[PDB]
Amino acid sequence: GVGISTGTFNNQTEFKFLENGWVYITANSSRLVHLNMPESENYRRVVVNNMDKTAVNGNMALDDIHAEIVTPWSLVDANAWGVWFNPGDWQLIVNTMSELHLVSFEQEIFNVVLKTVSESATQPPTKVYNNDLTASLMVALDSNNTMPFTPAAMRSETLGFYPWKPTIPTPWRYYFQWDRTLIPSHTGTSGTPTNIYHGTDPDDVQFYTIENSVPVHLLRTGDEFATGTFFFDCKPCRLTHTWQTNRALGLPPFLNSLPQSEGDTNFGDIGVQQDKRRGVTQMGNTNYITEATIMRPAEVGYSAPYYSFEASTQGPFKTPIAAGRGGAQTDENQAADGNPRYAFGRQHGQKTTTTGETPERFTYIAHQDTGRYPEGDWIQNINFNLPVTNDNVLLPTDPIGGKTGINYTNIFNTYGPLTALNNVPPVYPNGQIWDKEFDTDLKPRLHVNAPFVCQNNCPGQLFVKVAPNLTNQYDPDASANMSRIVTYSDFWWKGKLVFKAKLRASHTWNPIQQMSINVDNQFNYVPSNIGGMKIVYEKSQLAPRKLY
Amino acid sequence: GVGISTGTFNNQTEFKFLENGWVYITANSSRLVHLNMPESENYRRVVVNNMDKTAVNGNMALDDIHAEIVTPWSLVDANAWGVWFNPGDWQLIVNTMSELHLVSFEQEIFNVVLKTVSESATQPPTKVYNNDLTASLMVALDSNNTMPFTPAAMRSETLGFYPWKPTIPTPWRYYFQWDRTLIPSHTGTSGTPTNIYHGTDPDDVQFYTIENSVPVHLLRTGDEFATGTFFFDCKPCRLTHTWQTNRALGLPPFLNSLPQSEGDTNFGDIGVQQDKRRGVTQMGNTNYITEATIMRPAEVGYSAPYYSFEASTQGPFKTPIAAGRGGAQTDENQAADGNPRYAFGRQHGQKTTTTGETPERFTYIAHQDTGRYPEGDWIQNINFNLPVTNDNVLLPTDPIGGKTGINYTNIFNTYGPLTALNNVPPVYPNGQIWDKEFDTDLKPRLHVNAPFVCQNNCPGQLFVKVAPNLTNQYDPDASANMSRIVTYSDFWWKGKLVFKAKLRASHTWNPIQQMSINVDNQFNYVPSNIGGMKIVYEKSQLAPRKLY
Amino acid sequence: SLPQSEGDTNFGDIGVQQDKRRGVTQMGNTNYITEATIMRPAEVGYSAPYYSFEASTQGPFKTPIAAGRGGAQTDENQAADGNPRYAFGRQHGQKTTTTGETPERFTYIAHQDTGRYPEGDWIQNINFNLPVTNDNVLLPTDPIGGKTGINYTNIFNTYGPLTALNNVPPVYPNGQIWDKEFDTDLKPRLHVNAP
Amino acid sequence: AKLRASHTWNPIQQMSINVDNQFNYVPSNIGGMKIVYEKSQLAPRKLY
Amino acid sequence: EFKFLENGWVYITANSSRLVHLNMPESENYRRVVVNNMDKTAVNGNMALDDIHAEIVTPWSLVDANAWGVWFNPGDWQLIVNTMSELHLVSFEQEIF
Amino acid sequence: YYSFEASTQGPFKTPIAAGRGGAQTDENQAADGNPRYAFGRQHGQKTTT
DNA sequence: CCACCCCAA
DNA sequence: CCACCCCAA
DNA sequence: CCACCCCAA
DNA sequence: CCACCCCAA
DNA sequence: CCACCCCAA
């Protein structure tokens, strides 16, 4: 064994150009992972109670109460964009390609090393590192996805985005059924509202164990653990955005009058009065045919309650939203159309030569315009009879429930069997790749965290742990937890992710928005005199498309 | 693994004599290379600004401003003559052979050893060296020459020329687009001329990475990395020099009068006046047919500006020249005909038992005479009507631009579609072997650094690095750069370079200039009582040939 | 020596004196190895006379040039590296809703840098012995022929069998596509009007 | 022609539509057209 | 038309069908004409303004399509420029109807 | 033109491969290096000379 | 896996 | 088990 | 040598 | 019975 | 002689 290599390193991005604008994208990410000895070799059940934040009777979205069980097992997640590509590759797929497709996935672990630490208390004292060539590593595959699913992208507990940079798995943990009650309360709400931790419903007690449910492969130094090739059965992702609303659909009016001189100030007037125009409307009252009135085939996107913090048996939680932009990013509401927010640090973006424990983030703002400006709507009477009168129109400005800050926009849900929609684009790096699917008879149309949602089972989680190294004293009949040899192990991980996508043709006349290097970009994609690295976020879908 | 050998040592020079004066020269150089742990495991971008030398307003050729990026990767170069032959072998190829041809090239690495250093702070303190048999070496081949090309001969960062002497690879580095401006200025030029470091043109930003672009082979102790056999498609090199100018071409005059007694003082006179001689001239004015006047089929070599420091977007740089000698090495200008200059130290010549940081060098002066004595030219009027008059002739002595030191010789470029030329001979040892070729639609006729310039792709660079050995503490989310185990590794490198050349026949009567051992050479090719070694430079092409 | 802190102001110094550096130069006089001195395999582009209006039996005509850019387009000479100039009207660019007989044009400035800043060269004595002295260096500023405006840069031709070159890129729209070839035994390496 | 692959890490200079381009590639209320000149070779390469 | 082949190879076939108009030639005779602008080349300053040449006019009207602007639009170019590395010229065929 | 170079053997004129240029009434029979030929009796020239 | 100072009894 | 800045002489 | 919370695509 | 400074296109 | 914004159901 312990004499020779087990694998090879490959962090290459291969572009296999096929026939009919079809390409083969096989991304390989061979990172060297380090891992320490688990604190406890015992499973824990821990309750988090931050009922010191949920008492101010102002703060209710700061509820951090949950019940989780810790596992001595250390997980490994590679479900991210930043791990599979660099700023150079992405630009290619984004500028050159139209739509992308996910294919294969196979993980491989090699060149396992396990070293023991000897603390020679002499003066300094000093530390002597050695090799326990008989030591082991405990590998586990949940090939039968028997266990919960913890995508470690959500909390930037992924793998390093810089290959030449050694990374670390994430200590595994999952949810245990915690029951609670918490009633809202503003600054004024007198007395203590209501908030408690019931405990646990004996029905919903799922206590998992990797040792019991999943085999463990005891690797040494001269052993290689490799997966297979995982074929993916999920829907394509489109590298295109829709810029069409409801006012940019169909046959525009006929302009009986056109300018005769230049300037975007000289407007071509139709030349007919609104209550004598031909065409179709979805009204039986009026005779006014307007760009706002006319009947359009359907509705793009929807309008839902914003900052609508619902709640159930586990506690309050915000209401998701799958909306593009809508309104020039100078007129948002980065809320209404729920724009993601990403917080990472040092190992998944951010300047490597930084300091402190303060993340950096960005509020990714797509290109697609299905989103809304809930500050330019209105609900009026069936009689129309405008110019509408106050008592005959409920606007954004007009409070609802007597309170100021509130709206009908805030409480509004316009989602009809006529709602048209586009899935959540990739958010690279940071962003997630693929995400399991709910086991509910009825399933969400699309997820908000990943462009891909697998239709069948997805790759099984790779759980990586260190095997207990024991001393000459060990009494299994002791209250305390024995004393083991301070062991750690570093191993090389490799990845092969396969994507298949199409090439974009030109059909307009006007060039399309591409990705480039400005005089303001340059030093965003290059190391610094000290070796300061960081990966910036960049828009995915930047290329027009027709919605109708 | 770790029990047995992986390779063998061979530093033998094989001469396979074939049929028709054809020989097979297979040089093998198996050197044992040592390599330390890279400072930083991060890539750097560093700017060099020596704007303390370029201010004296005298010194403009001392511009050392460039932008380079450091790579944790340590390179290995063997593109030299001294590594493949010894003073004994060369003499053979030089004295016996006519023309030489480059064939195969294959590298092989074996008997990898990785040791950790334990610093036992106790009294001295003391150092304890051990073996980390599970450690690794990261090998890389740029078989797809995706990366820049850094021939490490230029700066004598090659490999040792003495086989029984352990050597060291060169820390890899390459150029990053640096923009600058610098205007000349003599001792007098008042005020501060102009000189700045613009920065970087966002267009020309190439940030390479070996991990990303090239696979890495993780070698242990019981692993062998070997290349293939690289076939070379470059032009032959001639072990012959041309001694013919323009005055030694064709049918000399007929000497109507010959001496009748001895002495090189008794000259045989033609016996006809210059303005009544038969033959051809390239003049329509005169009737004077002279050895200087007569029409010769073409022109040997050319005459270019000397110490013509041009400049572009990166900064000033001297103008190359490919000229033999011209004038007895007692009358040079070691400038006009640009004679190379070589600076090495201890590991590539020079007396091993030397001290200090002061190179030794030599100004290699070929045998071929295509070079010029720009101190015996002249430009005169179309009327000729000599004896030429001042106002009718611009000579070397006559200043141009009003300044003394300057000439028309200094600013002169006589390169016509009639210029005949001979490539730059091998400069052994030191000198380079083969050099990639520019990727420009139009390409240089010949290089000034190497006899061989490959027509297609050349061998890929061999990048040798040490794998990060990590301790029990490592936080990838730290501003500082972790702490690794002080690891180094020594490995044996072997080389097989293949050459095919022809044998020289005798055709004159007078012996040809050969290489020998004088009473002044002897102790230039033998170790000393202490073991002082050094390799001297020696002329390549020493054997006549006809130019016409 | 490498910096230990950030900033493009903190430069990493080599740490060796110029007249004691190892490597190769194309000089037999000096011992100074500099980024300007060191021997490079060849020369990129060339340096020719600029606004060198020759003439023959048909009449005077300017001297072509096939050079990229060289120097940040903030430091040109749109002459030295002969940048094309294009004049069209209404049917080959230009705003259709225009008037008069006055073309519109552009001076296409490539990306490739083979071009030169002929305002940062110099020709000095074989002795080097710098800091160079006036009488020992002919610079751009220094007139040639007694006239001011003139240079040696203006009359200079550095084109050696070592000159590396890249052909003239497409200039779209306007620009030409393909162009016949001269019927001369000897032919131009590349044209300046067509890729 | 051939397709370009990515080999660096830093994105390459591409052609795009700015807020200053837009109306350089579209007819006008009257039908005013014109075609601007644009750089050809905008992508690095190695000379050595 | 962009015909994507195998091994990053593409086929670019540009078609430009323009409607040409043409008037009756002035003269149905060939001419030989000399241009002498020796009113510009006298100021003894202006020598690059020499517009003297000898040309012969043909009643025949030519047709040139040797340009980039005729074969592509700002949309197509951007593609070839952003997506492709090196370009190669192949066929050329003209048709009048 | 009339650029007499030199090397190790001695000075020698610089060749030129140029046609004519300018009406042979405006030459420089030098600039465009026009050949010059000198023979006698057995390769031209009047035999009865 | 040792042959006549190389490849190569 | 090195070919023309990727897969892939 | 990863398929739909086990053996077992 | 003339081929690339020998035998020997 | 109309198929999913090109060649090309």
PDB file of C-alpha atoms in Angstrom, chain B residues 339-455:
ATOM      1  CA  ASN B 339      28.345  39.636 -30.238  1.00  0.00           C
ATOM      2  CA  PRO B 340      26.522  37.760 -27.433  1.00  0.00           C
ATOM      3  CA  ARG B 341      27.471  38.213 -23.858  1.00  0.00           C
ATOM      4  CA  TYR B 342      27.070  35.450 -21.252  1.00  0.00           C
ATOM      5  CA  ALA B 343      26.941  35.751 -17.417  1.00  0.00           C
ATOM      6  CA  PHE B 344      26.749  32.554 -15.328  1.00  0.00           C
ATOM      7  CA  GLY B 345      28.000  31.530 -11.889  1.00  0.00           C
ATOM      8  CA  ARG B 346      29.298  28.390 -10.204  1.00  0.00           C
ATOM      9  CA  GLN B 347      26.521  26.042 -11.578  1.00  0.00           C
ATOM     10  CA  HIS B 348      26.960  26.770 -15.306  1.00  0.00           C
ATOM     11  CA  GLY B 349      30.682  27.279 -15.697  1.00  0.00           C
ATOM     12  CA  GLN B 350      32.948  29.443 -13.566  1.00  0.00           C
ATOM     13  CA  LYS B 351      35.405  27.971 -11.066  1.00  0.00           C
ATOM     14  CA  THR B 352      33.466  25.965  -8.506  1.00  0.00           C
ATOM     15  CA  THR B 353      35.946  27.002  -5.786  1.00  0.00           C
ATOM     16  CA  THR B 354      35.102  30.681  -6.219  1.00  0.00           C
ATOM     17  CA  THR B 355      33.336  33.135  -3.914  1.00  0.00           C
ATOM     18  CA  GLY B 356      31.092  36.192  -3.956  1.00  0.00           C
ATOM     19  CA  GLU B 357      28.222  37.152  -6.251  1.00  0.00           C
ATOM     20  CA  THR B 358      30.137  38.308  -9.339  1.00  0.00           C
ATOM     21  CA  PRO B 359      29.548  36.406 -12.641  1.00  0.00           C
ATOM     22  CA  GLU B 360      32.046  35.476 -15.236  1.00  0.00           C
ATOM     23  CA  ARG B 361      31.392  35.913 -18.838  1.00  0.00           C
ATOM     24  CA  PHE B 362      32.633  35.879 -22.294  1.00  0.00           C
ATOM     25  CA  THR B 363      31.880  37.722 -25.429  1.00  0.00           C
ATOM     26  CA  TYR B 364      31.601  34.939 -27.960  1.00  0.00           C
ATOM     27  CA  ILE B 365      33.176  35.930 -31.267  1.00  0.00           C
ATOM     28  CA  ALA B 366      32.240  33.555 -34.115  1.00  0.00           C
ATOM     29  CA  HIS B 367      34.388  32.576 -37.103  1.00  0.00           C
ATOM     30  CA  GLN B 368      31.994  33.532 -39.932  1.00  0.00           C
ATOM     31  CA  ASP B 369      32.632  36.917 -41.488  1.00  0.00           C
ATOM     32  CA  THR B 370      29.401  38.589 -42.476  1.00  0.00           C
ATOM     33  CA  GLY B 371      29.961  41.291 -39.825  1.00  0.00           C
ATOM     34  CA  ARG B 372      31.223  44.809 -40.562  1.00  0.00           C
ATOM     35  CA  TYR B 373      33.803  47.510 -39.703  1.00  0.00           C
ATOM     36  CA  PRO B 374      31.381  50.497 -39.790  1.00  0.00           C
ATOM     37  CA  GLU B 375      34.548  52.656 -39.520  1.00  0.00           C
ATOM     38  CA  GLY B 376      35.419  52.214 -43.213  1.00  0.00           C
ATOM     39  CA  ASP B 377      32.314  53.057 -45.218  1.00  0.00           C
ATOM     40  CA  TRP B 378      31.030  56.138 -46.916  1.00  0.00           C
ATOM     41  CA  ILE B 379      28.247  57.790 -48.702  1.00  0.00           C
ATOM     42  CA  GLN B 380      29.176  60.127 -51.654  1.00  0.00           C
ATOM     43  CA  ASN B 381      27.515  62.064 -54.528  1.00  0.00           C
ATOM     44  CA  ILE B 382      26.033  60.520 -57.677  1.00  0.00           C
ATOM     45  CA  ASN B 383      28.642  62.370 -59.746  1.00  0.00           C
ATOM     46  CA  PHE B 384      31.463  60.313 -58.192  1.00  0.00           C
ATOM     47  CA  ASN B 385      33.991  62.575 -59.767  1.00  0.00           C
ATOM     48  CA  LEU B 386      36.644  61.584 -57.224  1.00  0.00           C
ATOM     49  CA  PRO B 387      38.987  62.011 -55.671  1.00  0.00           C
ATOM     50  CA  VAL B 388      35.790  62.666 -53.722  1.00  0.00           C
ATOM     51  CA  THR B 389      35.479  65.977 -51.944  1.00  0.00           C
ATOM     52  CA  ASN B 390      34.239  66.614 -48.415  1.00  0.00           C
ATOM     53  CA  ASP B 391      30.978  68.306 -49.349  1.00  0.00           C
ATOM     54  CA  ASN B 392      30.599  65.239 -51.616  1.00  0.00           C
ATOM     55  CA  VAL B 393      31.049  62.436 -49.009  1.00  0.00           C
ATOM     56  CA  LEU B 394      29.509  61.646 -45.606  1.00  0.00           C
ATOM     57  CA  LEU B 395      32.027  59.509 -43.691  1.00  0.00           C
ATOM     58  CA  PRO B 396      32.030  57.744 -40.274  1.00  0.00           C
ATOM     59  CA  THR B 397      34.011  60.534 -38.670  1.00  0.00           C
ATOM     60  CA  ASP B 398      31.481  63.203 -39.883  1.00  0.00           C
ATOM     61  CA  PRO B 399      28.788  63.837 -37.155  1.00  0.00           C
ATOM     62  CA  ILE B 400      25.042  63.611 -37.919  1.00  0.00           C
ATOM     63  CA  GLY B 401      22.543  65.655 -36.030  1.00  0.00           C
ATOM     64  CA  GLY B 402      25.265  68.071 -34.895  1.00  0.00           C
ATOM     65  CA  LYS B 403      26.359  65.798 -32.016  1.00  0.00           C
ATOM     66  CA  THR B 404      29.848  64.310 -32.073  1.00  0.00           C
ATOM     67  CA  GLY B 405      29.580  60.721 -30.977  1.00  0.00           C
ATOM     68  CA  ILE B 406      26.833  60.132 -33.598  1.00  0.00           C
ATOM     69  CA  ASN B 407      27.182  58.789 -37.150  1.00  0.00           C
ATOM     70  CA  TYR B 408      25.213  57.820 -40.140  1.00  0.00           C
ATOM     71  CA  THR B 409      26.712  54.421 -39.415  1.00  0.00           C
ATOM     72  CA  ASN B 410      24.920  54.598 -36.117  1.00  0.00           C
ATOM     73  CA  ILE B 411      21.599  55.352 -37.953  1.00  0.00           C
ATOM     74  CA  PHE B 412      22.360  53.303 -41.122  1.00  0.00           C
ATOM     75  CA  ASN B 413      20.221  50.269 -42.363  1.00  0.00           C
ATOM     76  CA  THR B 414      21.456  48.476 -45.481  1.00  0.00           C
ATOM     77  CA  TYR B 415      19.238  45.516 -45.756  1.00  0.00           C
ATOM     78  CA  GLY B 416      18.165  44.770 -49.206  1.00  0.00           C
ATOM     79  CA  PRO B 417      16.430  41.900 -50.888  1.00  0.00           C
ATOM     80  CA  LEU B 418      20.078  41.060 -51.756  1.00  0.00           C
ATOM     81  CA  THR B 419      21.260  40.476 -48.173  1.00  0.00           C
ATOM     82  CA  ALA B 420      22.808  37.002 -47.666  1.00  0.00           C
ATOM     83  CA  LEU B 421      22.881  35.635 -44.099  1.00  0.00           C
ATOM     84  CA  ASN B 422      23.982  32.796 -41.810  1.00  0.00           C
ATOM     85  CA  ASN B 423      22.161  31.852 -38.567  1.00  0.00           C
ATOM     86  CA  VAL B 424      23.616  32.213 -35.018  1.00  0.00           C
ATOM     87  CA  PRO B 425      25.953  29.342 -34.217  1.00  0.00           C
ATOM     88  CA  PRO B 426      25.762  27.276 -31.006  1.00  0.00           C
ATOM     89  CA  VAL B 427      27.463  29.014 -27.926  1.00  0.00           C
ATOM     90  CA  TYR B 428      28.543  26.142 -25.638  1.00  0.00           C
ATOM     91  CA  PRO B 429      28.153  25.433 -22.888  1.00  0.00           C
ATOM     92  CA  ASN B 430      25.892  28.283 -21.542  1.00  0.00           C
ATOM     93  CA  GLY B 431      24.082  29.074 -24.898  1.00  0.00           C
ATOM     94  CA  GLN B 432      20.486  27.804 -25.626  1.00  0.00           C
ATOM     95  CA  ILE B 433      19.489  24.816 -27.857  1.00  0.00           C
ATOM     96  CA  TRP B 434      15.979  25.249 -29.319  1.00  0.00           C
ATOM     97  CA  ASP B 435      13.475  28.097 -28.899  1.00  0.00           C
ATOM     98  CA  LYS B 436       9.762  28.221 -29.581  1.00  0.00           C
ATOM     99  CA  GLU B 437       8.673  30.460 -32.456  1.00  0.00           C
ATOM    100  CA  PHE B 438       6.665  33.686 -32.499  1.00  0.00           C
ATOM    101  CA  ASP B 439       2.928  33.269 -33.198  1.00  0.00           C
ATOM    102  CA  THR B 440       2.976  36.181 -35.630  1.00  0.00           C
ATOM    103  CA  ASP B 441       1.653  35.643 -39.175  1.00  0.00           C
ATOM    104  CA  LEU B 442       5.063  36.936 -40.227  1.00  0.00           C
ATOM    105  CA  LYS B 443       8.018  35.378 -38.481  1.00  0.00           C
ATOM    106  CA  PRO B 444      11.692  36.127 -37.895  1.00  0.00           C
ATOM    107  CA  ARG B 445      14.014  34.450 -40.387  1.00  0.00           C
ATOM    108  CA  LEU B 446      16.258  33.314 -37.530  1.00  0.00           C
ATOM    109  CA  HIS B 447      16.685  33.766 -33.767  1.00  0.00           C
ATOM    110  CA  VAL B 448      19.725  35.196 -31.996  1.00  0.00           C
ATOM    111  CA  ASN B 449      19.527  33.021 -28.883  1.00  0.00           C
ATOM    112  CA  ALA B 450      19.259  29.473 -30.374  1.00  0.00           C
ATOM    113  CA  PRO B 451      20.641  27.641 -33.462  1.00  0.00           C
ATOM    114  CA  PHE B 452      17.291  25.741 -33.597  1.00  0.00           C
ATOM    115  CA  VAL B 453      13.903  27.147 -33.811  1.00  0.00           C
ATOM    116  CA  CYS B 454      11.287  24.607 -33.867  1.00  0.00           C
ATOM    117  CA  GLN B 455       8.609  25.098 -36.962  1.00  0.00           C
TER     118      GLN B 455
END
